[PDB]
Design a protein around this ligand. Structure first.
Ligand SMILES: O=C(O)CCC(=O)C(=O)O
Ligand code: NI
Length: 329
């Protein structure tokens, strides 16, 4: 095993070689799957290295993302969300506008310093992706992003197999729960920002603390830093960027699905841990994996020894997620 990616305040996030799961004999594969699962059961986060997604293609996806966010605001808004529940296209958090009708109670006004672009699967009636015009630097944007979507789709399936192998159940247990690919590819851009912004403003952050809603999130980050994970002792710990890794974390739905054997951990993005006048732009890409909308989510076999140990009632996956997202708007 590699040295842990993070080891502080009781938070241990392992660094795991995923090729040893995909290519190993039964025994090396099992060992790797146990390490993966152990990570999810303790930190709720792992780093994976040597995944089947190529570094040059990943670099290209990041360059493609930055070309999109370099578009004028008015062009990015052209691919904004078509409705509030679309969950597809361009978004930027906005603070409420003060007007002569804003009363003293409403004056408690900071939003995430970020913008995003969300892409779902291309074969979903009622939920098409709003693609930008393929011209100048955005030629190939669609094929690049759809490609990356499908590679992340495959990686999700394989992470779930590692979880199944680690649990000692059928390797393919999750396949029929996730095969629709009801996943969201989220491109993120955190603009350049003066460090003084954070000196003046108290709890200004790049992304507010939260847990993810779904099963698994695959997080690709650049070298800027700023991602933090809450330790079991209540303190935020830097998830330092490691070249050519993917950070993988469990979401609330998997915590539940696992009967709380797996952790969904609070995390956030703050100022990078680098002292500088101006913090340059930070790019990341989160691929939110979910069970099929129609899936009924109840305790995974092996996560409870008896009926009484089942902590949660069953729920429909689609329903749960729209509930969590409706509240977000
Ligand atoms: O940008 C990051 O590193 C984390 C983003 C994140 O946690 C999210 O969008 O859910
Ligand atoms: Ni998150």
């Amino acid at each position: 095993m590699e040295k842990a990616a993070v080891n502080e305040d009781g938070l241990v996030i392992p660094l795991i070689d995923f090729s040893k799961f995909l290519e190993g004999d039964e025994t090396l594969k099992l060992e790797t799957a146990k390490a993966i699962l152990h990570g999810f059961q303790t930190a709720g986060f792992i780093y994976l290295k040597n995944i089947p997604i190529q570094p040059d293609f990943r670099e290209h996806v990041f360059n493609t993302s930055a070309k999109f966010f370099k578009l004028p605001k008015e062009k990015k808004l052209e691919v904004g969300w078509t409705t509030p529940e679309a969950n597809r296209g361009y978004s930027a958090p906005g603070r409420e506008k003060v007007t002569q009708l804003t009363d003293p109670a409403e004056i408690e006004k900071a939003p995430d310093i970020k913008e995003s672009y969300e892409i779902g699967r291309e074969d979903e009636p009622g939920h098409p992706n709003p693609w930008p015009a393929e011209q100048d630097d955005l030629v190939g944007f669609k094929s690049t992003m759809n490609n990356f979507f499908d590679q992340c789709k495959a990686l999700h399936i394989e992470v779930m197999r590692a979880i199944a192998v680690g649990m000692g159940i059928d390797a393919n247990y999750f396949d029929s729960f996730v095969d629709v690919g009801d996943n969201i590819l989220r491109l993120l851009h955190y603009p350049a920002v003066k460090s003084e912004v954070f000196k003046i403003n108290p709890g200004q952050v790049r992304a507010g603390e939260h847990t993810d809603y779904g099963s698994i999130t695959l997080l690709f980050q650049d070298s800027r830093g700023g991602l933090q994970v809450k330790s079991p002792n209540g303190q935020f710990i830097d998830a330092t960027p490691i070249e050519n890794t993917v950070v993988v974390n469990a979401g609330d739905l998997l915590a539940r699905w696992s009967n709380d054997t797996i952790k969904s951990t609070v995390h956030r993005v703050v100022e990078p841990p680098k002292q500088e006048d101006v913090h340059p732009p930070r790019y990341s890409i989160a691929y939110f994996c979910n069970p099929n909308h129609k899936s009924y989510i109840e305790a995974i076999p092996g996560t409870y020894a008896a009926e009484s140990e089942r902590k949660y009632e069953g729920i429909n996956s689609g329903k749960y997620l729209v509930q969590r997202l409706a509240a977000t708007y």
